[PDB]
Structure formats: C-alpha cells, structure tokens
Design a protein around this ligand. Structure first.
Ligand SMILES: N=C(N)c1ccc(/C=N/OCC(=O)O)cc1
Ligand SMILES: [Ca+2]
Length: 223
C-alpha cells in the first residue's frame, strides 16, 4: 500500500496473508473455512495466516492453517485478468474471535464515489521497494466506470472496477494482490492489477466481487 497508514493491530480481522515460505498475497476471510483471494495468487502449498499484524513476528493472536483446496474461477484469464478471483478452503476451521473475523459478501454492487478500505503488506513505494512489517491501510473512492475505462483503454471488463486517486500518490501495490477492498462493511473488491503503483492517471483495478456471489455460494456449498 502506497501513501496509506498503519491500520492498527487486528483492526482488519478478515485480512489474511497467504504464505508459501514467505508472504506473497493477501486474502479475505469470508467464513470460518474459506478465503477469497485473486486467481493470479494461485499456487500449490499455500498456508493461510490469520490474525496477523507484524507478518515477521509471532505476536500471539495468529492462526496458521494450511489450505486443503484452491479453486480458481472457471473463466479466469491470466492474460487480461478477467475474473481474477479464487477461493481457498482451510484444512480446519478458523476460531473466530475479535482478532479473526469474517467479512460479509455483498448483496448489491458498490457505488461510484464510495470510500472503501484497502489493506495489505505490499510495497509502500511508488518507485523503489520497501515492504512494511505491519498491516497497512488505505481509504480510497470507487471511480466512475468511464474514468476507469479512460485510464485503461481496452482493458476494463464489467468484472473490474477502479478505485483510488487519479492524481497518483495513494494506491495498492505488489504484495497487496488478493487482498480486500471493503466498502460499507461488504467485500466489494479484490486487489487485482494496475500500471505500476500510485502513478498519475493509473488507479488500482479491482475484481468486482458482487458479480461472483452466486459462484462463491455455489462453490462453498459443494466443496
Ligand atoms: N493498485 C495497483 N496499482 C496494483 C495492484 C495490484 C498489483 C499486482 N501485482 O501483482 C504482483 C504481486 O502482487 O506480487 C500491482 C499494482
Ligand atoms: Ca505476526
């Protein structure tokens, strides 16, 4: 997260870290057994880490649970990043408490102009590289679809939305991939892609979770 702020320990209790020997992506806990992340975060041997603040120090509130299965969206296209969503099932149910909690799926799509909370342990520089210890947060508005399409001509599908600041300076970044965009207490987006980070006229592009609720519900009812 570039140009954001330190969230505060366990104030984003649905935020997870995906670990494969190292942190590589974020995710969102949607119930005791399932995490929503980006399909571009897919790999084998994922361990889900819940209740994290400092990802490099065991502070006492963590739950580390291996993934039992990963389910990439059936229409995910890794070239265009259309349908950039994946479900990850935990080998055992997480213990839900104040520091580990699920985030609601949306019943309707979010509105242009709505300020959302984006979070992660990704790069904090728009140029150069610095990775934070503790979880970072960013408040950013959903942009109009016309401004989104103008920023990325020929690249924005109906399964994507833009959020952030056209002036640049504030954005999600590498390492935040798969993490939450929460608007009005609902998981509305997943950190997907963008040209660089915090670049002028290049806002963040996010998977439009409201389009996937049926698929999510069907998949979790059957796996
Ligand atoms: N909001 C952005 N500008 C943005 C969002 C997501 C990415 C994803 N990078 O994937 C590689 C990785 O995470 O290691 C890049 C830029
Ligand atoms: Ca920790």
């Amino acid at each position: 997260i570039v140009g954001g702020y330190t969230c505060g320990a366990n104030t984003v209790p649905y935020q997870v870290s995906l670990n494969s020997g190292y942190h590589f992506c974020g995710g969102s806990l949607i119930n005791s057994q399932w995490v929503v992340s980006a399909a571009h975060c897919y790999k084998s041997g994922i361990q889900v880490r819940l209740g994290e603040d400092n990802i490099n120090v065991v502070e006492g509130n963590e739950q580390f649970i291996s993934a039992s299965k990963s389910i990439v969206h059936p229409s995910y296209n890794s070239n265009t990043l259309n349908n950039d969503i994946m479900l990850i099932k935990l080998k055992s149910a997480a213990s839900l408490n104040s520091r580990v909690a699920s985030i609601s799926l949306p019943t309707s799509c979010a509105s242009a102009g709505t300020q959302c909370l984006i979070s992660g342990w990704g790069n904090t520089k728009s140029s150069g590289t610095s990775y934070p210890d503790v979880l970072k947060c960013l408040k950013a508005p959903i942009l109009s679809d016309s401004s989104c399409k103008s920023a990325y001509p020929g690249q924005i599908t109906s399964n994507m939305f833009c959020a952030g600041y056209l002036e640049g300076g504030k954005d999600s970044c590498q390492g935040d991939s798969g993490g939450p965009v929460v608007c009005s207490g609902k998981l509305q987006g997943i950190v997907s892609w963008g040209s660089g980070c915090a670049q002028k006229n290049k806002p963040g592009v996010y998977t439009k979770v409201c389009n996937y609720v049926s698929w999510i519900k069907q998949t979790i009812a059957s796996n």
